[model samples]
Target chain A: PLLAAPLAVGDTIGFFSSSAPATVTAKNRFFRGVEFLQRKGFKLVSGKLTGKTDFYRSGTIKERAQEFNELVYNPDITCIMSTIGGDNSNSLLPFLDYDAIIANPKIIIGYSDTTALLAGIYAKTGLITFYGPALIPSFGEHPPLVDITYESFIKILTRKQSGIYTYTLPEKWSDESINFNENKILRPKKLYKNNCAFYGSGKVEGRVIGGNLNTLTGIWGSEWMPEIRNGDILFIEDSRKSIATVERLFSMLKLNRVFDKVSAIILGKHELFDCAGSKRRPYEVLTEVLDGKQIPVLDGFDCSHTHPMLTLPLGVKLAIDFDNKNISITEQYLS
Target chain B: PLLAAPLAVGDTIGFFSSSAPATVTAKNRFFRGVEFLQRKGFKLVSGKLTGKTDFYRSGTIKERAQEFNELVYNPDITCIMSTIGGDNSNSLLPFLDYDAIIANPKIIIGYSDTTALLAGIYAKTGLITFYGPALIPSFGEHPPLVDITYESFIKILTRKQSGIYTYTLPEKWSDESINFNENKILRPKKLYKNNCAFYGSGKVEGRVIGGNLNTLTGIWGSEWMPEIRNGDILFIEDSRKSIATVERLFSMLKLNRVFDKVSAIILGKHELFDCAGSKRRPYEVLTEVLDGKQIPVLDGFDCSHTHPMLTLPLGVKLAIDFDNKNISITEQYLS
Candidate 1:
């Protein structure tokens, strides 16, 4: 239920828009991503909704599902990535071709709203999906940062590695925005010194599970969402959410008994988080929701909405070193 | 178990702010609401976080939970109301005094994000909770809307009607925004003609369940969310959301098999909805998600964020006559 093989140079990567119509509306960034992949020697293929949009989304529910299902059936597409994440990716879950995905297991990668498909594909076909750089948001970045983002993308999915691959956390990262005149290129964004906090000690290992925490709620408790068994490590991140909302999402995990079941929590850095007078970050709010229920937490990981995102294979064994502040995969995710 | 009995005149209503600091920020509106309640011959008990603020919310998660739990155990407090819903009422669910609540069930009412508490309380204790009004937004309005709101509030929770209280849909409604500059009262909002749609025919009876559709996702599969059983009429609504988000919420219900079980749908008015260029209402979005499933639908019912909201008992048996376009309670909710 994993990948057929590691992605190689010259392989075709089919990109589609499951949620937002980023490919159509954000054409500059979308094409920039294609140019990046083309320069990387990877053949870029377009999914059905490559430039098509139906108002707020790429298409209707059936059209979006068919767009994804078509790629799942195509033999030449090595990895199917998303153009960008939107709010309605979960809408396509019911109509996805599970049997075809299982029969032709390829690398499927994206994050944010695509959490629906990542967890749904994993749950339905047993394929180890990747929580990695989405095409438009990740590869379309203004250089230096683009290279930083692609390094992890290539290292995890494309490049061949021996033994365990350790993640070297970036020294600095940014979620800053730059104004772009629809017709032209834009300037690079401001960066900050990374002070990513790891709140626990010692080594902890488990199968990693999660994506955009808010996106996870879309398909939660359904057949599409993977089961959160005991000892599973939950990695959740969000973008542009208030402290109040962060508390509510955490409370949902708590109310569902996720705290008791999961061995540890890995909270990614929240992008443009609104403190709403509390001036509290996502982790601080989570700590209060924990309410003295001691859970090992490694907060402010890099696998989130910000530039230079790190990719992790969903349904694969992940080991974290709290003492050394290191995180790595402990098992093979590809055939 | 239901409440001991319908709240009598002069009964105490304890108001709490589980999330938003409306009691502090909306001082004029808050006092106006208090005055309205005071003039009604009822005593008002303020929750600990009344005028308090912790930034984006009324207080910290623990403080918010404690404020609600304190009211749950208050001996003289007959009913508990929310000052207004913010984003974090779900935060208090884990820390509520369930045993104390089960022992003293009363008229617990609020709408929007307060759905978390109503559904959570109903699920835990089997006490029929009311989905009605909040103090600030509902009662603080400049009359005749405030009078119109309270008339239904009084009729449903206070009157001694024997059986079958049919809903008389108001000729007009509003979700208009008004300026509240902290001191003086503003002019009343403009009302629109009520053309609420009931999409299917014939009578349908079921135990009514549901509240704010967006808020349901906050407590979704957890014990805090009441189960949607077969033949249950789902009453749902939202406010100020884009069509893309509306699609996502409906898709969640579709994926959860909510569409397969519920006998009918009761959609309330969406206040200040943003269709995001799709120009599609929530019901149209839901119908697309329904995908050929023909379920009875009653759209634009007044029991929502819009002014002149109706009160209904969650977890109680209710019957809807679609042909006659009548919605009525079939059983005693207080016993």
Candidate 2:
């Protein structure tokens, strides 16, 4: 695997829309995120599909591919981030400029539907991709929490702390709803106590693979999907899914022998997951599917759809110490 | 592939719930479907999980698997049916008694989430399973359409027509809203012209494999999924999905290079698929994904989520005459 250089002050960060046209629909939030980055000492370049929409996605499959390809080839951009995520990012995988991205490797990052591109780029080119905040949904998130998200983004992407890093959990976080247009948080998002559970003991480390469990099915069994190697740490999360759907996904993992392969599992906090009256969390449903199979799991990591999302690198070595109940990056991501 | 002896009028049909607790929830419809089949001169055996519920699913993973195993081992039953499909069906795949099913080699069938079992059974045991009516949904429907569905069911499963069969499209069909409990057609349902499209020319014959497209992903790439081979005719259908979700699914096939392998394609009618204001049908999105690759296609076949559902055998030899635009069973389904 290769590491792209860390972002420096005044370095260019290019933004693209691979899936939903949040650049058009979330107009106020889009510009807010742009200016926020500018204020953070990064020059910004817009993708060709900025403020463009063709119904459910930003463009036709070929057009969306070209939009991402353009940013992949740009020499000036130190990093490439998504405007937001939707269901169509996987459509661009086939047409992505993998060779170009490798030749001029730079940090690439996004979450949600962007799992398709993140996992694809890693599998194809072996360049680490970030499963972190996007332009609109992350930086555009109204402040207090946005500051924490930005801090985590910088802590991972910038050179100062890139050598070895451990996450500092926010005292409070939320996925509460608010209007995005005013460049302000409409309400103080409901705060939740962090009861991130840890199961098992001792230190375990492996190459981290997986993001957005539901999204994994999209690129599964293809050359684009990174193989889940034995002893790898599987990090997965979901948002607004029914309990049955969650059960189906976990069962698919079991069928694929995922539970048997991974040394440890990290489940990010699910954003408003509907237990479907079962009132079971994602882990509980996973336990039902596991049905007595023993697998160490750490539940409720901060890097997900909820507020104060953390940026983590895919395919990099990550270590978790159950004794201290802490997760830390153990490998380099900066060139 | 192996075939089972045809089901006789007095033969016992075993029904199980692999996923949803439809038997417990849909009480009125459940008994109505039972009486409907009983009057048809067939004996019924309830699965162990029948009328059982463990919150979101019919039972625990182990229990569901055991329920299915019990029916698989039942010597008196000539045919096995599903009560209905829910997302949890795939969870029961691992613990299923594939050995017992192969030894007994009786007809096993259901559609929707039942595709997991149908595809898994064929993949493991090489026994032909029918992608057809379930007990509660199809047999429980109000009359006229129910009668038509029943007739098609018999046409496919019974001895007389089991040797060679061609489907006769119902003069009228409806996926319209109806209360299944009353077991009566309370409202006149709207009907549409059959616009089944045929693409490409000449004859293409191959083994038929596939069921609900969404359900296929649940077992894709595992032992449960049948390998999509060259010269195989892929039959797939879905219901109540948006155009973007449909595009994502077709793109997954493209990513897996499925279009490169299959010689022909069969798309069953999608019950109320959302075109997402583009007014583009599923075939159009498939065409865009195909991107110049050409293959014979039989669009909008009747063996799907629609009323008057057809009982089509999976893993059986199927011939599609695109020049003549007709699909026919080219081999015997019953021993």
Candidate 3:
């Protein structure tokens, strides 16, 4: 099983980062991940690209591309994951050898700005890419992983077929004080249900194609962008962007007529709100522009820029039923 | 002396600015200024330029030029100050005639982005310009001026002739926990003195010209820039700019050879500590760039971005003694 034995204790996983390497403190976080795997009795193998840093991360774009190529071809490594996401990851798209990636597709996981890499890999290779936690911020944190976070990890790694995923919002919002180098202040977890109304009736199945809004904008006019084939469900999310900025981004999509081809648009939660100003809310503005488009516009999905996030398998076919109000995975993420 | 007037409890001073008018709470702040001046036995003359809102402040470049021209020519206006300084003030230069301004040169004050307007006006028309308090952020506030602020302000308004200015470092930095509804914050009073060393030795006499660095960059390659005649001491300051950004800006001056004609350059205290990251300070970077040049490069002077700042008469000829550490105004600011 992809989730058992080789994936378990003493198992070696390779790191293939598409973004900048982790900060010094972030490297410490990676050790915590090693500890977590150790407690589960798994040995980890880190790639040469795991913590290397120079100008523009991993020396240059070509070097990062080559590192990623090596990670996929390495037989000893079981899975590949990114370190973090940044602004200029799209610069690496042209230099990447997609044929090599498609030939030896491995379990890849990342979200936010890494959406480009995930979608790019999926578009080129008929392989599923997971949009979820990276090493430092998530898997490499100081303490043991949160129960829900760990559960989601297990589900993504262990489950062979699509299954129902349930998310429990905490009674209070998680305190982000640890991020500021301050003493951790415990707060109640505040989770809310995904209450956005569905835009279309009836069930439709398609593969997921999208990522962070900013990253999408960077690759929009580039040759790296895959053709928006009919019925490809578009998944999009943003972090720390004002409503106007979000509107501008969505307007870019509208201008490109990407919405005209997608079966449905699933919006992930906007994490940081009112970046420039509070003139508009992200979800509100998105809904306002997407109104009457006759496409399914679903929101509050736990896929981006938020904590306790779910790992989504990109390019894998998923059945979205507005009538039943459920999204079910139709294919296995791992071969 | 401009600072001699008691400004009896009810004198009305007109408010004007180089940039767009106030927004939201800033509007209320202007009213607060009116009420504050009223309470002090002074009436506030709200200029026609006060509450107007547009992307470029006065709607168009021509309109902004006309608005400022009218303000400068108005007889009833006791004093005129900038609302704020922004990127496009240089756009207003072509529409303004020097003769109209040289004939009336009212008490004009502003810094930062207002550098070009101040320097241009002084260069074209030998009118003395005041670099001090502005309307929107500085004057238009709920608990208007601090004791030091008021004292310095009175000195500038009443002192027709120039005197040595001094600044004292504050024992404690005060964030002035007032309502920042307009995105402006009031700082507490700090001690000040006029005793400081000059960058270049020996005495050189000339008129002073210059303002904000960013503002100067905006006007670069334009006819609006003041001709750097021989013996003119150029004064410039900047806030919230990275060292690299400062380098880029300074390179513009180097390219234009603006420093060649100037006897010396007196730079105001850089408020770039917050934004320069861990790189070299702006002053250090500046010194490195201006190393071989024979011209004086003075830093840590009064005026510019810092509060309780020295109010400089823009075009007044002044004698600067670098060796003796003295700067004496040879001519009075008023006609």
Candidate 4:
């Protein structure tokens, strides 16, 4: 796996809108996120499609790819992130500058729909992209939540790590739907105490892969999708999806015999999951799909669409200490 | 390819609910459909899960599969059809009795979410499955359109074809939203004269494969998904998706190099497609995704979600006579 240099305090971080026009649609949050990063002594560059919208997407497929390519070829940019993810980011994959990405391996990070790009870049160029915060949604988040999110982001991408690095569960997390257009939070979100749990004992270690389960469908059978090798630790999360949709997605993995190959699975906390009156959790649906496959499972990990999201580097070795109820990175993700 | 014997008068058509609880949810339409087939001198058999509901689905994944398996194993049943398609049909893939299907080889038919079953059965047992009307959604449709739909269905599955059977364009079609539960049309839907067009000249022939585009994602990379071999003609359609989502799905095919493999494409008319103020057609999005791949494309074919849907058998040789603006079944789909 290819590793980009670790992020620095003054390094320029360029942001692009891969699918959503959140920069314009959520102007308050966009500016708030920018200022938050600026306060950390980082230079921020706006991608060409930042203030643009062509209906539901920021631009056409080619236009979106071009905007992202500009950032990849820009020597001034040390890290590139998405403004936010929407449904159509996979459209940009075919036209992406994989060669340019290989020539200049910058830290690429974002979650949700950005999974298309993160996974695609990793598959195409063998670069380690991150499953972390998007600008408008993460750094732009209000207060105590946003601070913890940034702490995790900085800790993963910028801070030095020696040997192994274990992740401490945040004191709290949330998936509250606040008004994005407003300059202030309408109300402080109700946070839940961390209940991250494991379903089996002993440690399972393997190279980790996967992202937004729904978004992963957009690239599932393609060359852009990274092959899920034997014994890989699958990490998948989703947001605002119905229980039925979740069931179908998990069943999809099962039918592909993914459950038979993976040594372990990590289900990220679903953000505002709709149970459709079934009152069934995502992991339960996955268990049903497994049909008695005895893979080790770690449930309710904080690295997801929920607030104070933790950062995870794709295409890197990960360890799940089920006995100790701990999760950690087991290999270097950066130079 | 395996062919089921042609439907004869008084044959039994067993219907199962693989996903949606449409039998319970649309009782009026369900009865209307059953009586419609009964009036045609064919006996209709209801599968085990009819009128059953487990929240968003007709039943749990195992129950749904059991229902389908019962129908597949019933020697008296000449054809098995879906009552309706829903999100969870792919969940039934792992539990389906493929061995029974191979032994019995009863005609299997359905479209939309039933794409999972039709494609899966064909892939697993080499049985030819029909991508046509489901029970409640097609035969249950209001008249004029319903009559034409049955005409096409009977013509395809029963009639003997001494040579290539050509498809004549229907007079009109509609994807109008009628009150499905009230046993009334409410109002006659506005119809459009068929405007199916071709993008290239001459004839292109190959084995036809694919169904609802969105549903294909559920089984895209799995063993259940039929391999898109070189020189194959691709047939795909969708229902009630925005242009952005349409763009992403089409881009998915392109990224997977499906465009590079297929000799031609048959785009079924999208049912109630939302333009999202972009005023772009589904084919336009596909063209953009094609990005200069010059494959002959047949646009607005009637074999889709729209009313009076044609019965196109999966895994059969199909010919697109672009010069004559006609489509034909070049191989026998039934014994």
Candidate 5:
């Protein structure tokens, strides 16, 4: 496995908006996120398309790739993160500087649509990329949740977990929709007590894979998609999608025989998922799609679109003990 | 290649609610469509789920497949079509009886979510399927458009086109939304003058494949997705999708290196495409994804979600004369 140098307190972080122009659309939150990181003794670098917009995306495909590529080659950057994720991050796959990414080997972290780049880079260069917090959404939020989100980020990146490291669920989480450009609390958005369900017995260990279920469809069947090998633990989540769409996604995996190969499944918490008038939740849809398949499943894992997200290293070995309800990184992911 | 027997004047046409419960939700149109086909000297058979729905879809996966398989097994049913499409058609893929379909070969047709079944059956059993109108939406439309739609269906499915069959562009088309349950025509749907653009010089010929672009994502990376071979003409269309989603779909094909293989592209007219305030058309988005690839592209073809849709045979040799702006079937599809 490939590893990036451990993130340091004084290290520089480069942020890019490869798809959505969140830096412009959510400028207030963007600055708040930058300030939040800077207060922790880290300097910041912004990519070329930071404040840019070509309607729905930051820029054209070439322009987006150029912005991300610039950060990939910069020697001053020790970690690269996405400002936000939108529908078109996969547009940059062909134009990305994978060779430069291999040469630089810095900590690459972000969730949602950034799954395209993280998974693409991991497939092409064998570098461990992260499926974790993005700048604008994760760190830009109000007090309680934002602090918990950062604690996970710092623990995974700055501190070493060489032997074994287990995860603890956050006290509470939210997927509340307040105007992102504003700094108001909007009545302390409803937060639910955290919960998780492990649906099998014994311990399962394998390479951990996957991110952003819908984003995975954008890169599915491509060389950029990492092959789901035998005994691998598949982690997937989606945000604001309907139950119908979620069923189709899980069915996509079943059709490809992914369930047959994987030893276990780690399903992340879906953010504001529309049930389409059906009372069934996301995991229930998965259970129906499984159709009596005996694969182990861990439902409602925190490392997803939900707030106070866990930092997970992709393309690395991980273990889950279903009886004890524990998930841990079992391999070294940072040098 | 496998060919389904051609439709005859008095043959029974069985209809199934594969995904959406159009028969129940749009009962007036359903009966009108049934009357329309009956007037043309055909009998109609309703599948088990004709008036049944489990929230968003017609039925559960097994139940839907069982309904479709019953139609596939019945000797009296000479043709099978979907009543409509929803998001969960792909869920039935695992339970479909492909061998039974291979043994009882007959005309099978629908659009949108039904693409999963058509493409999956074609890939699994080599049976040619139709990327044409579904029962409720196409045949159930008011006089002028429905007549033109049936004309295309008859020309391709009933009439002998042993050597060649050229597609004549319809005189007008519309994607106007109206309440499907009502028999009243609030007003004649405003139709636009038909037009097509053939963007290449000379003729390009190859086997034709593909359907509902978004639906393709569900079956992608599986044995159910037919491999796009070198020199194949890919026909793809979508309905009610946004500009951003369309870009992601096109980018998906690009990332899979599909453009590097296919000789030509047959792009059907998108129905009610949401531009997301950009004012850019679907074909323009395709142009951006293509970037600089010099592949021949025929844009705004009539065989799509637009009213007065053409009946297209999947998995057959097709030829296009770019100079003359012509497309035609060059091989036998119906036995």
Candidate 6:
């Protein structure tokens, strides 16, 4: 069964991509990540879209949409994950049949541009998706996954109840040494609590919904964007954008009136050095933009394209206590 | 008098950015690039856009457009150059009046994304625009200018007739220093011609058209794009896009049937390292895409975001001999 995975070696775990298909090498490396799971006792499954690369991946947007639909509905698949994120994942969003995904909900996880699919699935169908490691970046790599990344994965997959989501910094954001097929990098980890006491504060609970800021921005004008005003606790993170770019994205949010709709805004830790240019403390710029928007604007939360990331579950009910600074998952999302 | 100056020592040379304004430090450094010209008897000019921060030039796109218009129409200014090229320059293209630019054409030069404005102005108004130095990266710097950049700049500004457009490559592309300062790293010039044997070898003379690939893509559905047609040589260059991304752009060109309209396609030597993700030789990918086409697709010609780049006159009648690997300015471009 797609939902129920009996503990066994070589159980098929389907690899699909809401983003672009992985490069051949990236595909092999991703299989290695799946093998890590296999060593931990699980097998790999793949959707047709895993390796397909045409003009726009399976002809038209409608076709790509169908590919994801088929993967979600396939009974043989235990879990579904993406290869990598690309620019036009938003294009594929309009074609997705949310009802199909909801009817046969399977665990789906990816980050970066995959935020569109993750947030969209959760928003539209109330399917709790995992916002964590994808096939290529995580599963296909070497041992010693970022401690927090590995821990969070276990917490989401193996645990049945809600837990606190903590913020920690990683020594590096993006690894350039992948050219040498080096899966992991050696770096320090730093963790810090959210800044500026909670905006909505007092124990408030709701389903989780949100993802990479730029990807969300990409889908802003489209129908695929999650209906945040419908009482979803939004989790937002951005990677390797300059302070100016960060300010611009937030301004775009302001222009689009995204802040007023969400129940609460959880600002994720922005890993600045991933891209060119430097920022002298980007959070300071974020605070200036939020300008005391009475939302729960928390920073230093380490869930992004960084090491030691927290793989939060979308659509699951989570309670937040900003006064005491703690997040507790109120329900068990997986069997 | 704007053209011919009994120039004073401190006469301002207003540096305006058609794309986006530079940081104050960046602008100052750009002014340093013009120091050699100042030393050889020319004054520096700066506009309001040169020093503004947070916003691109002034505030909104309209403001930047307006600032650029003002700079162009200003009687006090002798020459106009850009601070930098960015994603938003295409947005400003609509705001520019072709007649206004033609009526008051000054010596303006910048490559990469600035290609849109350069090609657009040349196509629409028949005013020869220079594709050369910018204020921030080329002119406004602390150290002395690169001899090639400076030499090409002076050659364009002083020559009444367009002659041979020559470029020499360096032994290595300068990474310079990573710090976002104006400091530059110069290496010994190991110059080579970027002429790949033309796919369709024949001497065909036509007006030059096209700019940075990404910028051109931005204006695809917009009014700013030039009406380039058959027998016209399309000058295409890009900065820092992945080989896949480059291929995609070329595919878009193929899909739009852009190649059919062009007599030849000049593949400008791209500063490949500037692209996102892993680098692949763009020439190989380009050659593969345009393999069967009748048009001559030439590569290794330097006219992009690189040092010692050739300053090509945009609207001039040029004779290109693919067989002999020769490009010559056939006539006088200016009175």
lDDT to native, each model? 0.87, 0.88, 0.60, 0.90, 0.90, 0.60
Candidate 1 local lDDT, residue A272: 88
lDDT per residue, candidate 3, B71-188, as tens digits?
A: 7677666566676665556545646777866565466677766676776676566566777766555555434233344556666566434454433332222223245345354553
In angstroms and one decimal each, the interface RMSD of every candidate reads 1.0, 0.9, 12.7, 1.0, 1.0, 8.7
Q: What TM-score would each prediction reach against the true structure?
A: 0.98, 0.98, 0.50, 0.98, 0.98, 0.57
Top DockQ model: 1
Name the weakest run of 10 consecutive residues (lDDT summed) in model 6 chain B.
B1-10
Q: Is candidate 3 or candidate 6 better by DockQ?
A: 6
- Taking the tens digit of each residue's C-alpha lDDT, what string does model 2 give over B225-313? 88888888999999989998999999999999999999999999999889878889999999999998998789999889988788899
Model 5 over residues A1-335: C-alpha lDDT tens digits? Answer: 67899998999999998888889889999999999999999999989998888888899999999998999889999999999999999999999988888888999999999999999999999999999989999889878888989999999898765579898788898888874569765577689887788999999999999999899999999999999999899999899998889989999999999999999999998888999789898888899999999989899899888887889999988999999999999988998
Better of 3 and 5 by lDDT: 5
**What clash pairs does model 1 have?**
A276-B55, A276-B56, A277-B55, A278-B55
User: Candidate 1, residues B262-315: lDDT per residue as tens digits?
Assistant: 999999999999988767888899899999999999999999989888888898
Candidate DockQ scores, in order: 0.85, 0.80, 0.02, 0.82, 0.83, 0.04
Which wins on TM-score, candidate 3 or candidate 4?
A: 4
Clashing pairs in 5: none
Q: What is the lDDT of residue B118 in candidate 2?
A: 89
Q: TM-score for model 2? A: 0.98
Q: How well is each residue in B195-308 modelled by candidate 5, as lDDT tens digits?
A: 778889999999998999999999999998999999999999998988889999999999999999999999899988999788998878888999987889999999888898
- Lowest lDDT sum, 10 consecutive residues, model 5 chain A, at A178-187
TM-score comparison, 2 vs 3, better candidate? 2
lDDT by residue (A1-335, candidate 1, tens digit) is: 46657888789999889988988788888878889999999998798888888989999999999999999888999899988998999999989998898888888999999999999988888888999988988888767888988888888886565688889899789987663214455555788888787777898899999889999888998998899989999989999987777888998999999998898899888888888756677777788888788878888888999877998888877898889988999878887
Mark the 10 consecutive residues where model 2 chain B has the least summed lDDT.
B158-167
TM-score of 3: 0.50
Better of 1 and 6 by DockQ: 1
